[PDB]
Amino acid sequence: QQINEGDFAPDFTVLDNDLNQVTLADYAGKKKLISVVPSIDTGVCDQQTRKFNSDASKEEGIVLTISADLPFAQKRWCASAGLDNVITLSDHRDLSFGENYGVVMEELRLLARAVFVLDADNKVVYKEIVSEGTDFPDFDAALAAYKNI
Amino acid sequence: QQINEGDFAPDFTVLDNDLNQVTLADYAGKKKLISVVPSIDTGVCDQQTRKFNSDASKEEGIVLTISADLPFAQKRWCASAGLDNVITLSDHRDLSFGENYGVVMEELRLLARAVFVLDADNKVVYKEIVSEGTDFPDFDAALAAYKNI
Incomplete structure (x- = not known):
């Protein structure tokens, strides 16, 4: 479905590293930077995961990596x-x-590189679906939107 | 749905490590030991993969690990x-x-631990699906069946 800035973010069900079910409610009350990658086992996605984690204040909110x-x-x-x-x-x-x-990415069954920033009410305040041929997501723009909450 | 000993091996389409499609025909004329695991990133499946690859003679045939x-x-x-x-x-x-x-394992979307041995005509000469609560596949029985072809 298409996410628009200003909408409230839909819920979802995913698995943490211990196979517990996690949903958006598990991070209630926090702002979220959601960084989406095709696979953490590829170099560009590794760099994207590390940079968002190191650059975002984790006393301010949560950085989720989903793949x-x-x-x-x-x-x-x-x-x-x-x-x-x-x-x-x-x-x-x-x-x-x-x-x-x-x-x-339906033909691959992988998730496209993307970034969403949700405020503490899960309003979507930033979205990037990284275009093909673009080296990396715009870290600065996403980090600014997350910091601005 | 159910493969038993004496049945013929179904075709399949899977991906090699470079995302090329691979099918049963890519291994035509060889006998096969097919080792199926939930995930090679778990220690028990890592051990199973290492053991079948080390113990099976690889110029009698092919050892495939599928997950x-x-x-x-x-x-x-x-x-x-x-x-x-x-x-x-x-x-x-x-x-x-x-x-x-x-x-x-439909509830997990993971493959069950299992072993199939195929002769070069793709007759299934040995099959084990490891039951829940059993520590490991029967390595020796599968390797003996593979050697005996």
Whole structure:
């Protein structure tokens, strides 16, 4: 479905690294920067995940990384990066998040590179679906929208 | 839906680590030991993959590891293991292999731990689906069936 800035963000069901079900309500009351990647096991998506996590204030809100990687890959990625403060969530089972946010690459069954910023009421205050041929998402614009809440 | 010993091996379409499509015909004329795992990023499935690849003679035939891991996870796994001869194939897009061979855990969208041994005519000469609550596949029985072809 198509996400528009100003709308309230739809809910979704994804899996954390321990296979617990996670929904948007698990981060109630917080602003969210949602960084969506095709796979954390590719270099550009690795860099995108690290930069949003290091540059966003995590005492201010939450940075979620969502992909169709299996939970097992996301857990192993965090361990190899040596990072215990990074949230990774897996949309592999149902593409609940991908379908609700309009970011499924259907022929690949992977999620498109994308960034959403939600305020603490889950109003969508920023959206980028990264265009083809673009090197990286606009980190600064997304970080500014997240910081401005 | 159900493959039994004495049945013929179904076709499948899966992805190699470079996202090329791979089918049963790519292994024509060889016998096959097909090791199916929920995820190569879990220690038990890592052990199962290493054991079948080390113990099976690879110039009598082919050892295939098939799972719903993304190709990127399988590619990284082979690189980090320093294992450039180990074939891993991803069923993530379609569950083509899992559905054809009756080994999808539908509630998880992961493949059940299982072993199929195919002779060079693609007769299934041995099959095990590891029951829940059993520690490991019967490596010795599967390897003996493969050696005896």
